[PDB]
């Protein structure tokens, strides 16, 4: 809980959220805090819940920026695009990325 | 006032298709056809029908590019974003013909 | 007028040379003629200043080059294949200085 | 079993340069044998980054490295000014072996 918290956030932009991609997203979320504790941070943006992009938000084609990502990570990114058919694209920015989101209804 | 050479391709990336949404895309296109003869061309992309971007594709925030665009075009783009919420983002290409 | 914000095309070159500097000029020229206020060129000579800023990162050329204007793509190509002085690039939404 | 490849992107080599890159090539294979690998790349030698290559601001990664390695890096950056930036991969090196135990 230091003063700053700037890290190379890996933003994923998805259309929808099918229970399976949500698993994999949770999966990939640990492959990161695990092998790269501190270096990266996942951040998913569902366009269906948030269509309008914020000035700083940019969506690049998965294929391009993927190759510079960790091996196990690239594999998830691959299922997501070619299988779970939900990954629109992604980006890599050194941003704030603080508190978790997803307006909680208590999700149980 | 001349149809020839380099063309701006305005790529709108949409999520959804409300009744108004369709109306305006007909207008924007009509505007670009009758006013920006050639100069500008439109190309709407349905991320629902197909989400994965090709290799040469990218979506940039609307507020950004729409700023430099011609008033009559920013208008329809502003509405497609903050009123119909179908407009995710967009890109600007400078090709020739397709 | 008081500045503005746009997408910056940061090229990272290992030093400079007449040709590379020419093309780097041709290129900059282009973005200010065809892609006004959408893309801004910003060259970073790793030879002059080696250190890297915080949000400053460098991705290989072929990765992020596909998504650029064709002409930007040609020049980027030559600064990388012909002059072989380009390390990589990046595309950030920033706040271009009134100059620097 | 894999290893943290600590790729270092440097701008040329100085006298006080190879100094720490010889002290870093040590501390690692020593206290952290097999743990944190290391491969130095002088851009000036070969600029063009490969499709899977990237360079990141030294303040970012280094800060998640052993307090000591951060010293050689830290010095190597502000003082000897040659460290353009660094990258940290977590993959497996299968180029050479010494002894292993696969289970058929």
From Swiss-Prot, chain B:
Effect after changing residue 33 to A: No longer binds CikA
Taxonomy, superkingdom: Bacteria
Effect of residue 43 to A: Loss of circadian rhythm
Temperature impact on function: Stable from 4 to 40 degrees Celsius.
Effect ascribed to mutating residue 58 to A: Loss of circadian rhythm
Effect of residue 43 to E: No longer binds KaiA or CikA
Biological process terms in GO annotation: circadian rhythm
Result after altering residue 94 to A: Enhances KaiB(fs)
Keywords assigned by UniProt, alphabetized: Biological rhythms
CDD domains documented for this protein: KaiB_like
Activity response to pH changes: Stable from pH 4.0 to 10.
Keyword Ribosomal protein: no
Keyword Translocase appears in the UniProt entry: no
PANTHER family linked: CIRCADIAN CLOCK PROTEIN KAIB2 (PTHR41709:SF2), KAIB-LIKE PROTEIN 1 (PTHR41709)
UniProt domain comment: Has 2 forms, fold switches to a thioredoxin-like fold (KaiB(fs)) when bound to KaiC, KaiA or CikA. The KaiB(fs) form binds faster to KaiC than its alternate form, so less fully phosphorylated KaiC forms; the KaiB(fs) form activates signaling through CikA and inhibits signaling through SasA. The C-terminal region may confer species specificity; C-terminal hybrids do not all rescue deletions in S.elongatus PCC 7942.
Family: Belongs to the KaiB family.
Its biological purpose: Key component of the KaiABC oscillator complex, which constitutes the main circadian regulator in cyanobacteria. Its composition changes during the circadian cycle to control KaiC phosphorylation. KaiA stimulates KaiC autophosphorylation, while KaiB sequesters KaiA, leading to KaiC autodephosphorylation. KaiA binding to KaiC yields KaiA(2-4):KaiC(6) complexes which stimulate KaiC autophosphorylation. Phospho-Ser-431 KaiC accumulation triggers binding of KaiB to form the KaiB(6):KaiC(6) complex, leading to changes in the output regulators CikA and SasA. A metamorphic protein which reversibly switches between an inactive tetrameric fold and a rare, thioredoxin-like monomeric fold (KaiB(fs)). KaiB(fs) binds phospho-KaiC, KaiA and CikA. KaiA and CikA compete for binding to KaiB(fs), and KaiB(fs) and SasA compete for binding to KaiC, thus the clock oscillator and output signal pathway are tightly coupled.
Subunit structure: Undergoes a major conformational rearrangment; in the free state forms homotetramers with 2 dimers. When bound to the CI domain of KaiC, KaiA or CikA switches to a monomeric thioredoxin-fold (KaiB(fs)). The KaiABC complex composition changes during the circadian cycle to control KaiC phosphorylation. Complexes KaiC(6), KaiA(2-4):KaiC(6), KaiB(6):KaiC(6) and KaiC(6):KaiB(6):KaiA(12) are among the most important forms, many form cooperatively. Binds to KaiA; 1 KaiB(fs) binds to the KaiA homodimer. Binds to the B-loop in the CI domain of KaiC; SasA and KaiB compete to bind to the CI domain.
Name used for this protein in its record: Circadian clock oscillator protein KaiB
Organism: Thermosynechococcus vestitus (strain NIES-2133 / IAM M-273 / BP-1)
Taxonomic lineage of the native organism: Bacteria, Bacillati, Cyanobacteriota, Cyanophyceae, Acaryochloridales
